[PDB]
Structure 1
């Protein structure tokens, strides 16, 4: 898709020029070694001073041919303990749904910062996994203990 590819080239240029410290967002490669702009390997650092601190959380960003009409699918690899991350790793967030708050102008930087924000502030109305949601509701102290253990596990 020329439209998707043009926008993705724009995103890549902007990202490389200026991006938040500790974040990574890089296109992958096709079997023939050429660049695949439709599938990016990204990483989000845990925010300092939070239970996520010290962790580096890898996630894939997958674009459909009709991007930026549609949002990318964003999927933590491996899946994370968080109330709004499905067991598959897929992130549940309103800016990531075409029929909710996605807007075509939203940038890769804005997506990754939005997901970082989500990490430290779950949305309890729409849980995506039972376990992290249940613990977050029942015992915030235990919830944070689990988050800290996960951040240590994913220290770079």
Structure 2
């Protein structure tokens, strides 16, 4: 139906000019389910890591936001163990003009600097606010075993 044309336009625009360090595609036969992979940003404690996530398109698109969930495990103040992400673009301030490229870029930029104003995991956010060295060490310890 109508959302389908938006999906083909999204896929074409992603294929012609792929973004940096990320790549998304249709995991299944239907166009609703997508799989995406992201490479750790260069100026971050996630060096060398590659991460997988799933994108679920609602039956009502683009006027309702999609839902993204991390497949792997990540040590970040804004992400739980099950992959839930606390991003205002996905829930609080979603607009139809936004594209999956923008939300993926925002997710990538989250790893550059975590948001401590509204952390989804208060404890590790408080740990990060305590000392940067301990947060860096624990993030590296998690990523050399989970990401790779």
TM-score (norm 1): 0.86
Pairs aligned (count): 147
Summarize the alignment of residues 1-156 of structure 1 with structure 2, pairs less than 5 Å apart: 2-29=1-28, 35-97=29-91, 100-153=92-145, 154-155=147-148
| Structure 1 residue ranges (4+ consecutive) displaced by more than 6 angstroms after TM superposition | none
Aligned partners of 2:86 and 2:107: how far apart in 1? 9
| Deviations, residues 91-122 of structure 1 (Å, cap 9, x unaligned) | 1111101xx21111111111111000011211
Residues 102, 73 of structure 1: CA spacing in aligned structure 2 closer, same or farther, 3 A cutoff?
Answer: same
| Deviations, residues 17-73 of structure 1 (Å, cap 9, x unaligned) | 1122331201112xxxxx221111101111113212211111111110112111111
Aligned partners of 1:126 and 1:3: how far apart in 2? 35
Aligned partners of 2:10 and 2:36: how far apart in 1? 13
Aligned partners of 1:28 and 1:64: how far apart in 2? 15
Partner secondary structure for residue 145 of structure 1: helix
Structure 2 unmatched ranges of 5 or more: none
RMSD after superposition:
1.5
Are the equivalent residues in 1 in contact too, given 2:56–2:67 (CA < 8 A)?
Answer: yes
Aligned partners of 1:93 and 1:36: how far apart in 2? 26
TM-score (norm 2): 0.90
Structure 1 unmatched ranges of 5 or more: 30-34
